[PDB]
Each structure stands twice: as structure tokens, then as C-alpha cells.
Write a protein that binds this DNA or RNA. Sequence first.
RNA 1: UGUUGCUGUUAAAGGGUUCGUAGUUGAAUUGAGGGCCUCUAAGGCGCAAUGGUUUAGUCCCAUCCACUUCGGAUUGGUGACCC
RNA 2: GAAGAUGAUUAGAGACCAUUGUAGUCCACACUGCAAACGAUGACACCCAUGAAUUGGGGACUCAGCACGUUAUCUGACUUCUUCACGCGAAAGCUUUGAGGUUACAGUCUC
Lengths: 129, 104, 207, 141, 223, 83, 44
Amino acid sequence: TMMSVLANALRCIASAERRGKRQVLIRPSSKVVVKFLQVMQKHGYIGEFEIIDDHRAGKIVVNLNGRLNKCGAICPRFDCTTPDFEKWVKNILPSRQFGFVVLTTSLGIMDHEEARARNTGGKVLGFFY
Amino acid sequence: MTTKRRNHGRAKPPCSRGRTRPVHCFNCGRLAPKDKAVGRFVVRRMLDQASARDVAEASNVYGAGFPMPKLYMKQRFCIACAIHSRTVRARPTDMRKRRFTTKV
Amino acid sequence: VESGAKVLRMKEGDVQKLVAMHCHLGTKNRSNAMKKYIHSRTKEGTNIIDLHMTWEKLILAARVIAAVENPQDVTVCSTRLFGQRAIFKFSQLVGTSFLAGRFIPGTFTNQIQKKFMQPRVLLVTDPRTDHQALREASLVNIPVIAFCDTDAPLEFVDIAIPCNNRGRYSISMMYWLLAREVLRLRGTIPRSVPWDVKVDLFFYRDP
Amino acid sequence: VRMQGVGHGKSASSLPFCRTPPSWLKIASRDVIDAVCKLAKKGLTPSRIGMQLRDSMGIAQVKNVTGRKILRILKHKGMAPEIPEDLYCLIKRATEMRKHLERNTKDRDTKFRLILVESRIHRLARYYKRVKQLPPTWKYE
Amino acid sequence: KEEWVPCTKLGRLVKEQKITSLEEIFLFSMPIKEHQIVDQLIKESDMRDELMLIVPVQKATSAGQRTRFKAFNIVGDGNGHIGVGARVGKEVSLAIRASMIAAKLNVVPIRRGYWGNKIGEPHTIPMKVTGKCGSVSVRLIPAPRGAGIVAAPVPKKILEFAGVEDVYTSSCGNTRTRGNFIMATFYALRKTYGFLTPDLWAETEVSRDPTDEHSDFLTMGSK
Amino acid sequence: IGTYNEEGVNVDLYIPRKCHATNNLITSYDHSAVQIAIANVDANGVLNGTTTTFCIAGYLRRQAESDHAINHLAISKGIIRIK
Amino acid sequence: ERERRMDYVPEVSHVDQAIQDGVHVDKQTFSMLKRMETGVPRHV
RNA sequence: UGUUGCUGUUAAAGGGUUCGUAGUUGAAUUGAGGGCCUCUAAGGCGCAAUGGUUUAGUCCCAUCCACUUCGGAUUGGUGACCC
RNA sequence: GAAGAUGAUUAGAGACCAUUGUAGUCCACACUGCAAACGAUGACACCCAUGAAUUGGGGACUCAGCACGUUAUCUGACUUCUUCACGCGAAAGCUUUGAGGUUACAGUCUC
């Protein structure tokens, strides 16, 4: 089976992006997968997306503008902290300039940049370039 | 080691059988799997052309009267067997991959 | 295009010619990448090409050769007798360079060779056996336009015109339409008259 | 994937995309209920009750034309079986294999199958004593 | 050198003042087929030519054997242009002369960004990149200022060429075959512009090729 | 557009071209990334002069996705008619 | 080369277009034509 | 010795297969709200008005009739649509 | 037909070959679990393109409102492109059927 929802979604996006395809299908939907997409659509990396309803589990559909290069998943959801933002941001990303790690917090779902700003660490979620 | 042949010299595909019955040779009595073994179909004459004339003379109810029968057989050979009578020969890379199916 | 008066649009007599000389059909075999072009299949099993599709492709390729102001930089290439004739008659009018008979390797890449040339653009009768040309267009930054059999691959073909390349009367039509319209947009032959000379000049004859 | 041994199949039954009752079903909740319980007294399992209903009366789903499905009906009227459907069936198949094997101890296939069916029944058992639906002293044998 | 005759469109333009820089040629992708295109545009007193390797190769023959010499050249400007030749000639001086030609054909520009501190002009690669030839693959990591060129002497050269003064690196696989290491390192420094970043995109406009604009004068050129 | 300093001054040698189809950076290295220039036409068949431009990437001629994308680009700009 | 004289007054051109010479073609071709903006041309 | 960051087709290395406990890992739902005023803040595939002789168009019409690939014709026409 | 016996072959030869021949080869009930038991490719799950076929099911009087075939579609299996796309690999090769999606290194478990 699949033991991470995110992993199932963002291996469709990455593959599709490397083939230059301008839409992708996503088999499941979660409250979580939504939030992840939302982020990247603000910062300009996605055109739009639709959630469709089968009344069992939804099928997300996304429009890629080709502005992504990867969307990963950090699977164990390891604990990152106020000092350790530095660590992750160096090690898994090609840059500090345009690398975006996305984290979970009690507050919501947000970029590392906004995480530091509000001074709360948390468990990591995923990342994109 | 190196995969010289994809099908391994067999008409047996991976992940299906893994066992196909042995079959004797009409040369040396060697056994090999049926798929490996080298099939040919002979259609062997019962008379040479030269002699066919002479016998068809003395015939009235045969030859002219009915076309002569032939001995049919299937011949399953071993690898070594085939090669030595040069009915199968080594081929260059591009040609080895070619097949002619079961047609002659 | 627009703004425009429905200019360079298919007409009665245009269609009348195409149907007649049987360039509306393709080749019998189903496509490997040109599946979209095909409109149904006949009870002879031959795949008809849609007319509107083909027409727009032709107008497109006109806009390309119109955008070269020194026509000699465009090349035409055939390796088939049926297109051979039509090349020569085209290179007179439009003023394109050409090589026909057979493509020779290193005419677009080999420096030490007196048959060396650097095209801006390239055409072909068949991308299948003119293929050597295309693969040397790739490394010199030269776009391509081809006359594609439905069967044919589209590898190293940027723009593609669906076509039948079987028989004389098929191929001649296509070159004739291009040449016509090109000269209507450059040197301003009007579309008011039917074009000056005949498709029979573009037919291979044998000497 | 198939639980034990090889198999991938996609043979399945979908749902309606309309969860409200058809216009050609003008039958009320009560009629549906009555039909279920009536049939049940023959000793029919819910699986065949639903089949009889859908085919004869055109019922889309029991759940669509009543507020509840087939077991909930039965339970409330005290006709429900105390051995779940899936468990019972396996035990029947099991015993029948054991007959065949009693006679034929050379039979390789049905032996291996019985091993499967056994451990499968055990999985069910374990389940239904976590989620109470059998006594907590239940065992296959 | 000896007097030169262009057989290339580009070559003609470069011999005139029409194309006045590498940038024009690069920006609308066109191959450089004559090394004389480099020398004319980029003046000497910016260019450097080093020989990274010269080694014997041997080809087997019955009885005695023929020999040859492989060699590499490396070339470029510290303003962010690099290019690596490798060639083969039956004598020393042959393969040397040949290398330097090929090298100047293969020239490619270099993007240098920052580490997240912006002062002066670029001192650091814009991102991590990798390049691979054979089993070796290099990982270039961007470093803060004052780090220096932290790599082995072989890539230290190759990085000095490309104007990268601050980097941290590591290699993998067999690195003790010299030739493979060079090509690897070079493919890394290409991959910069091959990667899309937010700073670059804005749907930047394209315009006509130098070739096209100057077509008339190339016609006259032919005469 | 491009890398800047804290002083706002461009540091780049050049800003590479866009492939409109995939919105990816056309490299100098790719020589299969062709720039196709079509000449526009108005009423009475007069050329406006070369105005529009397409740019195709060299990753679209390694499987011939080129044709496909050119159509979607064209059709959107009203250049190619669909019914 | 100039043994090739292909100049004839219509000849094969308008004959093929049918002056009344006729053209007949598949019923799929027919269906395509009549759904075009041009519609069927005469003699088809 | 590769948690960060290893390898196992052929180079050292996937167990002959299946069942199966400890152990490890495990799908989706509950839902993170709104209005009135200012702001040229943007978009508009909403829209009353009224503008525009081809100072911009296409369908209809007029005249030809051209067997078939000419046209123009004015107020054309709350038409279409454009600033 | 191992072992054994006899005849050759050979410088030497139960050799390889020839004529024989015991255990064994077969079956029932017990053990053994030692194979290149191989696809030298662990198991489950997701994404991933080109063409032509085959194997089952489904879709548009008398074992008989039947059976086969063609066109088209679909789900499940085995594999070919000797025009398999991207990509990977030291190369040979691998390609929805992965050794691909991996230094931009993290789906899960185990040996």
C-alpha cells in the first residue's frame, strides 16, 4: 500500500514536470495535500488546481506552468527547530536563495521563512525548488 | 555472467514455466528441454528423380497413377548436433536477433 | 490570422483539385505519432487526412518561407523521383536552394567539402529516407518542415504537413499550393486570378 | 493484492452516484424493512437478501430507500445471526476440504488450501474479538 | 596567424564589426565551428591556455605497436567563460595544437550568483550542480565568502578559470583516472543556466538572430 | 529580471531565452532549440513584416513533441484556425 | 532535359477537376466534405 | 559501516517457495467565517448607455452573372465585434 | 543404466566409443531438504510512451435463443519491436514487463 499520502502525490508532479506536461492527475486527496499546493500557487509555481468530488475520495487535478523543478517529501517528518532551520535549508536544497522547505506547526502549514518570523519550529513536511 | 541471449536460447519466456519436458535426439540420444531443442521438418523423398523415372515406367497404378508418398518426420536436434552438420551456423550480432518464426 | 477578411482560406476549386489527385488520403498504415491528423478510416482501410488540418499546415509553412528574405537560405530535398521534378520548378520561382537525387552527408556540417552550405530552414519530401538531412539540421540549429506520410515518424521535424507521398500527382499538388500562395504574399500575384502555370509541369515525366 | 497467494483482480461493484431514491421507486421505508425480515426467516444471509430485493423490486440500495442497511434492520428485530457472514462461509468450505482430505491424503492442493483457510479464519476471529461481535473465548477448534 | 578566410556566416560577421561579442552568438544558440571566432572577439590578455594532461595511448598491432598521445587543453576567461578540449595526435606537438582548437569550439558561459550575501560582483556559484563523466560525479556546493577554492588541485585550476573563488566540493567513484575528472567538473559548470530559477523568469523577450538581420551583408559576403 | 546586487545592478552575462511551450530556459548548449519566425499577414495578402516569434526547446525534438506544442501556441494567438 | 515538354493547354489539371469528367470517392470522404465550410464541390 | 549519506543482474552480496508471531509500518472524513466604506488595487470569458462614413470588421443584401478558384456597391444591417 | 565384466582406441585407457550388467530407473508408506531451486533481478504500492499480435472474461432441435471469425473497447495474465520514449548503468545491457522517476540522495518492510 501507500504509507505516505504526500509521496503518492508529489511523485506524479515531479515526473510530469520532467516530461514538461502541463497538467497532472492526483489519485487521492487530503486536507494536507491541499495546503501544500496552496503555498506554491501563491509564490507562483502553479496556475490553478481543481478538487473533484466522487463522494468517496476526491481526485485533485493541477495545472503546471512548468515553473517547478522538484517537489519532494520528507517522509519520517523529522523534528526541525529554530536553530535547525539552517541545517535542513543547506543540506536538502540547492540554495538558500530560492529553496523552500515547508513545515507543519500548531499554527498551520507554512514556509520556513514564515516559520522563523513567528518563531515556532515543528515537524517537516515537504520541500520544493 | 553476461546475458548473451535475452531468451537464453529458448522459446520459453521468463516467469511462466521454468520447466519444459526433455526430448531425445535422433543423432546422439542427448536430452535437452523441448524449447531449447532445434526443430526442423524434413519432407524426405522415397525416390531420387533419376530413379523416379525408371520406377514410374514399370508402374501403372502408381507414379503417374497416384503421386508418390514421402516420409515425413519432425527432427529435434541438440545444439552441438545441429552446428556440426552446419544446418545452424553462427551469425553476426544484427542477424542473431532475427527470427523467421515457425515458417521456412 | 486576423485582422483579415478570411484571407488564405480553402475554397471550392482548391478542394476540387486535392480530392481529384488523391492527396486527401494518406498511407494505409496507422500512425505512430500522427494519430490526431487522421479522420476516420475507409472501407478500403486507407486513412483519410482531414482537409482543414492540412490546409492550415500549408498556410503556416507559407508564413515561414515568407519570413526568409533571401530564399536561397531555404533548402528543398527529395530522394524520390515523384518529388524530384517539382523541386526544380519550385527553385526557379521561389528562388530556393536545393539538392535532389540523393542527400549527401556533411553538406550541412562538414567544413572541408565544396558542397558545404549552411541553411536557415530545410524542407523534405519524405522524412523517412531524407533522414540524414534532418539529423544534420539538428546540430546546426535549422528548423524543419516535412511532408509527412501518416506512417512516418516525426523525429527531428519541427512542423509537419500531412501528405501522401505515393504517386506523382499527390506530391506535385502540395509544392504547387505552397509556391502559389508564397508568390501571392511576395511580389503580390493576386488571388483573383487562377495561378499562371499548371500542375502538369510539376509532374515527373521521365526524360 | 490478494491476501494469500497470487492474484490481482479489479472485479468489484461500484456505487450509484445518486444516493437519493429513484422516481420509479415510490415504496416507503416500511415496505423495504418488511421484505428484508420476511426473507430472513428462510435462513437467507444479507448478501442474498439484497440480491432478491434489487432484482425484483428495482431497489437501488437498501441504504438509499431506508435509513439503514440490511444487518441493522435484522439486529433491531432480533433476527440477526451471531456468526458473521464472512466467517461462517470459510468454516463451511474448511470442513468440506477436511472431508476430501480424510479420504485423499495424496491430494497436495486441497491440503495447502486448508492451511490458508485456517489462518484466514483465525485472522477474522482475532478481529471480531477486538471489535466485539463474538465471545472472547471463541476459537476455530 | 596566417591570413584567414571565413566559411561560416558567423565568421564573416565577426571579421566585420557586426557581432562584437560572444554573448550575441551564445544568446541565440549557434555552434562555434572556427576557433578564430573566439580570438577576434575576445582579445588576448584575457585568455589563458593550460595543458591539464598529456599521456601516451597505445594501439596494439602485430609485432611492434603504434603509439599516440592524448592531451587535454583548458581555456577561458576569469569573466565567466570556460571550455575544455581533448584531442589525439600521433606526436606530442600535434595533439597539443589540435586540443587548443577543439577547446575554443566547446566554450560555454558561466552563471555565478551569490550565497545569500550580496556585495560587489559574484564570488559564488548560484546553486548546487553536478556533472558526470564515467563513474565520477562531482557535487559543487556554494560557499560563504572567504572560503577559498576548496577542492583538489585538478579541479582548483578548472574553477579558477570559471571565476568561481568560493566553493566546497566532493567527488565520488574512481577519481584517479584524470581525464574523466576534467569532463565531469566541466559539465557541472554548464548545468547552472540549465536550471530554472525564479529570478530569471519574467517571459523575457526574444528578438531576431544576428544572422537574419545581417542576411543582406552575408549575400554580399558570398560574392 | 536576472540576478541583482543590493545596489540593484545586473551581474549577468546574459539572460537566456524562454521556450514558450515548457517555460524552461533555452541553453546555449542546446543547438536543437530552434527559433521559428513566421511572418504575419493582413487583408489583401500583404506581409506586415516578421513580428511574431516562437522558440522551441531541444528536448522537444528528442521525441518530436515539437509539432504538438507549436499548435497550442499558435491556436491561442489566433494564427491557426480551428472550427 | 528540355526533351521534357509538359505544357498542355488545361490539360490534366481541369480534366481531373472534372469539366464533366466525373470524380467518385469514398462515402467517408463525402461525409468530410459536406461538413467542411466549403462543402462538396461539383462532380463529387 | 554509509542515521545525515552505501551497495547486492553480471564486480564481495536477495534467502528454493509459502504461511506466520514478536517487531516495524499503515488510506480518506469532522475544518480553520463573514459584511459596509476608501482606495484608479487589479482582473474580468457580467453589463445599461452612448461613441465609431472602410476614422475598423464579418453575415445579409445590391449589381453583375462567373458553368468552377472574380468583385466591388452605400445609409448597407438596434446584426457580429473592436478602442 | 552408475559399479562390475569383456572388445577396441592409445605410448599408457573401468577411458570418450562398442557389446553386456548390479544398485537405481516405476508404485505404496516413511526419511533426506543438499540444485545454475536462475530471470544469478526479494515483497507490497504509486507515476511513466511507441506498434503489431497471441491467451481468458465482459461490452457494442437435440451438451445448441448455438459455435467460430472480423471491426472497435475494456479489465487480468505471459512476453516482442530483430525503429520500445524519457532515464539509468563502467559497459554489456535494462524500459508501464525497470537495473527508470537517486548526490535535486528519505513511499514501506525484510534478508
